[PDB]
Design a protein around this ligand. Structure first.
Ligand SMILES: [Cl-]
Ligand SMILES: [Cl-]
Ligand SMILES: [Cl-]
Lengths: 278, 278, 277, 276, 276
């Protein structure tokens, strides 16, 4: 019944899905045809932001309108962290979700957007449970547990998914009297910590993101307990985006079926080569 | 209507009062005759705990019963931080408040008592706003803003009262969007930070404690915005406890009346000499 | 007082965009787009950053050409502490001098004694203490400055939030604690108290540094600024004239998201800029 | 077998074990309702205050204690001093406590407790340490705070640490348990056994700074199976009454009315020392 | 107004203010020619030696001093203790000294002295500090050395610092004064007022370690308006004669013949302590 619970409920519709970053209407249609649950409109895929640098901002509203017209699935778009006016603009365009995104250039180093001031649901990133709960308290309706952006290396996503889920599991069995100190140590609101304890999972939808390059990577994130995955660079920096996109969607749908995982992985073209930051 | 709001309401009755630490029934009757709003039963006054050392614990229930029978004003008693069984015992004795007190020897370095598990209201100490709000979330119905224990030096009480009240004032005018980060930096629950912002004061009664040795000290705490004062050592380590006790009560009642402050301060005996730690 | 007159004049610029211009063509584009004033300088901050070299006051000839090409107020930059550059600018007959940190510092320890001039000055700041020091020296207007020449709004946001945040702290502060606050700001007590009583900066406060889009400009206005400077963001973009207009409209209509969409829609390439992380 | 020793120690659940230095202290302990006595040279508060090398008690004094009571008799051996333990076993006592309050004899190795027929108690401060002591053959664990101070703070810390890690382990992803065992420096099989049981695989008592009935009941409410009391009884004003009060507190640990009654009008507690 | 308080304190120029702890000390001071007495609990040398928390004197003792003399009576309040100051003002004394020899009550904030009708004296060690105290409403400044040692070294240092910075300021390029005010962390308007006057905008006395007539005259030759003496009189062998000698030394500070006469055959000076 509360407006926040409605936004949280909306994002539950994406469970079991793949959200694909797209930079134009052609990428958007490929994503919808492959079975994406939503598209994410942005200026440049994370691998290009990494390689090229420059200030990365909200996409031109014209490009976002073109994407929204080209598909019938939900359209999300990115705003810079703390850039509440970029978010106002995106909401006024009539898209379905805003991603307050760390792959864009940070606009406010100390404060995120007050997401409760918006009617549209927000996705925010996190690396740990404290951070997820802070984003939710600010009004995020969905959490992206984020690894490395633009490298094709799943290592940090695995680390962060295990960190968030691990802390949730610790919390479930914890002595109630110790939860106050746990909330302090997370620097997270106590009420949301207790809600997480009672649910035994994050109070909002949790997707993995960062370095998902292969069907195996996507299925791994699902087997670690995520509700879905974002793919940015891994599709559109690969040799065959459309076939790879489809393979990743199938991998997320059939994540516990190794026979299916073999079939969809077999004879894909070149994966994004990416970069090992060690 | 909620059980917590009832406890918070109970403690409001003490506003404008002086709570006096007492170690036996004689000290208790002197305190009531001088006009104390309540007595605090403890093993040894903070100046003696400082001077003598040893492990300081909850007082023998027999001594607490003797004090409770000797007076008609509310009786409080101290329990060690985290010692929830000491608190169970105190509650079963039928006293009016428990002070989860830092002058006693810490029993749990990482966790305070879960005060919501008790029917009886609790007082807890603090040195800053974050700490006050953490104690309130655990279920404290009253806050003691604490300076130095057992020295007769008001400096740290002033510092901590100014810190708590100063942060409350900052909070009142703060951009709402910045309050999330402020709560993180306080390591305090956001809902209580917002409640403090809306009230423009602490959500529970706030008394000063630590080093109140003279009528001037007591009135100073009231002029800095406290709801009342604790006096431990300053009365019963002085030359004339009964007259000094009365003078301090009057100083708190008439804190903005310098003529009255002169009268009550005039010809008191020797104050506690105390110790300058600098 | 003569200072209060200068402070009063700057109040006309409230709700405006001041645009850095390097020649008379840029000046006319700025006026046509609805700029409240132009700022004559040798090179836009992004070019100073990229090229280096010593950056000084512009040639008086170029300033005269800009002043003749427009009817809106003309400002120009002088190096910090370079009081002779400022004497020259005043003698040219421009409307404001910006004692500017984007030019090469001429005096590391002292700013211009701005009370010795008839013309009003703009100075930069990063925090409230600095703003109040510049005002005491005679600045009639303050530019709260982020990063120069990068197109990244992050430091402007940081500094606007710092100045406005300290002003808000000051409003409710116990009067007895203001003496120590003034000491900690290293700011004159009388100006701290004036700021406390007004609940805002005692002069006009604009944002500057990294304003690249209409969204950026409206953000600065929603954070409480009186207007914005734009240097590089217009003239290092793909379509300076259309972008200039969009930024002006964004400042005028800063609380209207429907309007912000319209002016942002189909603008050409923004300045790419540089992320200093 | 080991499971037999572990089963024996389960009988002490709900009890108080009292340190005694002579046969008089032993009889006071049995009369007060102690589940067992612990024969040692000097109570921990005296070892702390006086220093010197603290060793196994003279066998003669241990024999005198064993004859004076019918409840189980335990006695202390220095860590790693397997010959002291051989001697104790040959005396015919019921348990050996390989004890950190005595002067360490081997800084790198504990007694190989599997070589003995008699069950052993060992101390710990964390779960890794408990599991290492169990693998060496400890049939019972004493989760130990500060010895000889009357300050319960470190016992609370260590009980919360052991029990907290057990609770983390219960819900842990199975695939992460290998790394958890590495980080505890504990044997994987015992870590998995702990995970499956949801508790320590042997009896776990609290010890260190238990001075009052409230302290004893606190340890029980935190999930311990019983408590050791060393100094808190025999460095107090009335050892016999305090001993009884502590036994009752452990038996009735969730009954605040009873805790008031037994705490009311006890004499002077051990004054002890605040180290922090 | 502030200018009225500043004008009042100008009357003390050329004088010696003597710390007194009772009415006997007060009468000795008035008889010796003190321009005012300073009522306090204990002389600084006793505060140093004995420690303890040093507070405002009992109002009764202050009333006794105020009745025993006709010269102005000052008394000490702890730094930041604005209620002690309220009390002193309500007693009807002439000046409050917000004094660093008493135990600091507020480490971050001094008394807002503009809220009082009575003039205040405050201490300083440098020009920035003096100007901050004046802006808070001090009507008089005490340039302070070491308290309770009888060693004039720090008073000389601080007098030279304040007066030296004033002399630098007089000739300074006006354009550089803004930065100078920043570096002093002092209000610009008061810095400019000091520059235009060529001296401190309020009366400036020396204090700290004045033990002999020579010390007192030295402070006057360095440009002070007068001196405080605390310990140097009442920790000496003959307080009354020494008190008189110091008054004469301040009155006749440039007359070496007079300085010889008043210094000749005084008893034992306070022995004091060399801290360095
Ligand atoms: Cl960044
Ligand atoms: Cl040892
Ligand atoms: Cl001090």
């Amino acid at each position: 019944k509360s407006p926040f619970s409605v936004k949280v409920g909306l994002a539950q519709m994406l469970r079991g899905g793949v959200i694909m970053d797209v930079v134009n209407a052609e990428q958007a249609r490929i994503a919808e045809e492959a079975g994406a649950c939503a598209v994410m409109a942005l200026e440049r895929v994370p691998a290009d932001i990494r390689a090229q640098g420059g200030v990365a901002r909200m996409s031109d509203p014209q490009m976002i309108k073109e994407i929204k017209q080209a598909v019938t699935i939900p359209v999300m778009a990115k705003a810079r962290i703390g850039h509440f006016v970029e978010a106002q603009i995106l909401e006024a365009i009539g898209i379905d979700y805003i991603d307050e995104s760390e792959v864009l250039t940070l606009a406010d180093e100390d404060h995120h957007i007050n997401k409760h001031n918006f009617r549209i649901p927000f996705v925010c990133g996190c690396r740990n449970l404290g951070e997820a709960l802070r984003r939710i308290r600010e009004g995020a309706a969905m959490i992206r547990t984020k690894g490395e952006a633009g490298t094709g290396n799943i290592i940090e996503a695995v680390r962060h998914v295990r960190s968030v889920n691990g802390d949730i599991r610790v919390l479930r069995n914890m002595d109630d009297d110790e939860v106050f100190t746990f909330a302090k140590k997370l620097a997270a609101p106590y009420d949301l910590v207790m809600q997480t304890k009672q649910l035994g999972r994050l109070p909002v939808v949790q997707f993995a993101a960062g370095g998902v390059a292969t069907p195996a990577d996507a299925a791994l994130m699902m087997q670690l307990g995520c509700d879905g995955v974002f793919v940015g660079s891994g599709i559109f920096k690969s040799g065959d985006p459309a076939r790879r996109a489809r393979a990743i969607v199938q991998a997320v749908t059939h994540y516990s079926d190794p026979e299916m995982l073999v079939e969809v992985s077999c004879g894909l073209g070149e994966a994004m080569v990416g970069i090992n930051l060690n």
